[model samples]
Target: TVALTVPAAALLPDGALGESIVRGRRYLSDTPAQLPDFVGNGLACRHCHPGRDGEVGTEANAAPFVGVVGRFPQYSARHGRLITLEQRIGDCFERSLNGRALALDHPALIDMLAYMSWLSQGVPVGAVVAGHGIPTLTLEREPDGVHGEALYQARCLACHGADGSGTLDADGRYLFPPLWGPRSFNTGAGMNRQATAAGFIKHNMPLSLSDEEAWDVAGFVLTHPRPLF
Candidate 1:
């Protein structure tokens, strides 16, 4: 589907369901800020999801929330079980958010799921929406920590910082989310995988070099000490 097919949050009505949808969007936009007890990181769902500034719909390889509701109860390789959409959100809480899972009946979980359902309003079940999945690249050169470190210094340190702890304002709140730290995603997060990180970087980072640099910088980022999963 074209990105526009996905609905925006403003389209919801003023009622209990509408309030819930608005809350869900807030939770997603600033997961750590709004749900600090549940999220241990500096990154929000919006950091990875492409829903910033009221932009809706999925983007290839960027973890968009659009068209996600109808895609479950999907199989999860990590869990080795068929999981509901709620469970999938739990996976991100534990992994990407570096936090604990929500209760199965939690109201916030319901709200988040409802927001996703709103985005999936017109999409068919078991269908692949355009730009719905993470994109991949075949590596031309084997990744090296030495090369990766150089690539990071060249392209990444400015935003993520020289320490890889991410930049912060005078208030000490994170500006760019940490790449590696006690507050960053743990080792079990999908971002920990070389191929997965490489894929994310290729489409999202560098602002200059292509896949090869992504492999390098992604590999380098993983080499630093971080919290264990």
Candidate 2:
């Protein structure tokens, strides 16, 4: 039987692992870094992948780094072959980062890889990567809460309720889950990250709302309180 050995590098201290985590966190936080200029006009990775829960810049979830490392080398229709995690990170630079691609051996790339690999240690691979295991959006600017409230009143209140407390469907399941506070997702839930939330809301949201409107409403939802019951 071929046994997989743990890499010595993977055994580094959390502080050592934290360097990449901090860098990635900073990138998600929109703090400036000394890295090369890439696409998106010097925007850091944080613009999409914020670290907090339901912070309002992206989707309805948090960006959970847990269990993200082992699902790579999977097939991608766009790439036309099995792509490794490193290749996917490079792709993020090319398409989202809007910067020049780094060589596969670059320290920054390796560091980020190390961080992700370390994060996924002992977690099962190839499990569902979506649903609850994602990030939330971070709001860089305060959304027009007034307008968001208006939107909710006009469109969302029917299902979500006046105070943003979610209601139940006929089947007794939640109709529109709360966004933040109390009954909403907990801090440890993966959907609390920003990038994961943003991507999801950008791609799928209200049945009829435009992308911009979804973002607007999402921003409002982030600021409201949820009921535990």
Candidate 3:
């Protein structure tokens, strides 16, 4: 994450930060119009990234940033090489948005970056990779497996299955990868932590469900068997 700085004098054409503030507010608001139409119908950046409330769908996955901007262009096992923040955003546009990747130099990309920079102001950059500190999980307890199971049977079984073994996408990739088990997070992966897992599920699961519901459903999925016999 390259720690980019937009000099205070460089916020917008009107010599004011209004545009930046407005865009940032709109994105964080998670309004319907600001969301992207993707597999779950309408997915907002707030859905994947943390936002107001401990909303489940909004908290599902953990990409917490204390100092993320300074660490980009870093190695990615999935991409097999270094990737710029813009490339990562474009990937989300293509994969998560189910839309075409914006050109690297597109104004939209710049705006998005500007929003992120604003959000991350005063935070260290590249802290995650520099061994500076660890990311924090805000949830206080593990989700209730019983509630999680019930929620899963009611809302998630159609897609992820009662056992939590996710189905495959049209491209042969797993649509909902296992939350646990060897095929999912290995024993050594940080996701083994309940708080980490819960935080992610709260923000980004069961597309149509509210953040709270997403949390409930994730509580179930996390406790379910890795593979349904």
Candidate 4:
């Protein structure tokens, strides 16, 4: 398995590519603020694909961008054909951000791709990095929203809030990000799917909980209404 390594910012070349990388990082870290016209909700890319050292999508088991560039253009069952990285990102904007997709050639989109390519530097093409994406989770029975609600109050309420509207920082961006509401990812987002949400919460939540607890809480979160995609 390929190990993930985030390239140092100091290594950025002194040219237009470097500028584009910086802009791309900013776009992912504060997407709603950086691309307001294309974002409808309060979520930024970092809200789900969190990372350390001020970079987005670098965390293990959280859809890290490291080595992601080589995996596309890849297959998408939803589209019935292979799709480019740009198309994958556009999917996020439409369903996950509850907003419009950017054009394939949009400058900001290219910048975002540049940043991902920078993150992917040194990794061989077509190699799947360790912890590249959230691991899948499957449960045998329907989730209990009742228990999930209790777990949410116990484990998730502080940051995500009792209403799941999340906390806002001084800069007006969400600190914790909304879980389910008008401001959260729309129903068509993968997060709204029980297994996907459970897998994400199991591995990436701010606090640790058992797999069952994660599954339940994820179910409870999805029980709430949000924007329709």
Give TM-scores for every candidate, taking all chains together and pairing residue i with residue i. Answer: 0.91, 0.47, 0.49, 0.98
Q: What TM-score should be assigned to candidate 2? A: 0.47
User: What's the candidate order when arranged by decreasing TM-score?
Assistant: 4, 1, 3, 2
lDDT of 2 by residue, 154-221 (tens): 87777667765566547543445444555454333223334444445554444355545555666666
Q: Tens digit of lDDT per residue, candidate 4, span 19-128?
A: 99999999999999999999999999988888899998898899999999999989999899999999999999999999999999999999999999999998898999
| Distance from true location, Cα of 58 in model 4, Å | 0.6
The per-prediction CA RMSD against the true structure, in angstroms, equals 2.1, 14.5, 10.4, 0.8
**So what's the TM-score on candidate 4?**
0.98
Give lDDT: candidate 1, residue 8: 59
- Candidate 1 has an lDDT of 0.77
lDDT of 1 by residue, 69-162 (tens): 7789888887898999888889889888889888888998898887888877887887767777557655866778898888888788888988
Best by TM-score: 4
Off by over 4 Å in 1: 1-4, 55-58, 169-173
Name model 2 segments beyond 4 Å from true.
Answer: 1-32, 53-63, 129-199, 202-229
lDDT of model number 4: 0.92
* Candidate 2 whole-model C-alpha lDDT, 0 to 1: 0.51
lDDT of 3 by residue, 1-229 (tens): 3332223424434533557544644543342245343222233444345444322111212453324456677786758999998887666555443344667886555666665665456656544322222233354455567776777778667876555555655754454554544334333333444555555555445555554555555566555333221
* Native-to-model Cα distance after best TM-score fit, residue 208 in candidate 2, in Å: 15
Whose lDDT is greatest here?
4
**Candidate 1 residue pairs that clash:** none
Q: Report how far off residue 211 is in candidate 4 (Å).
A: 0.9
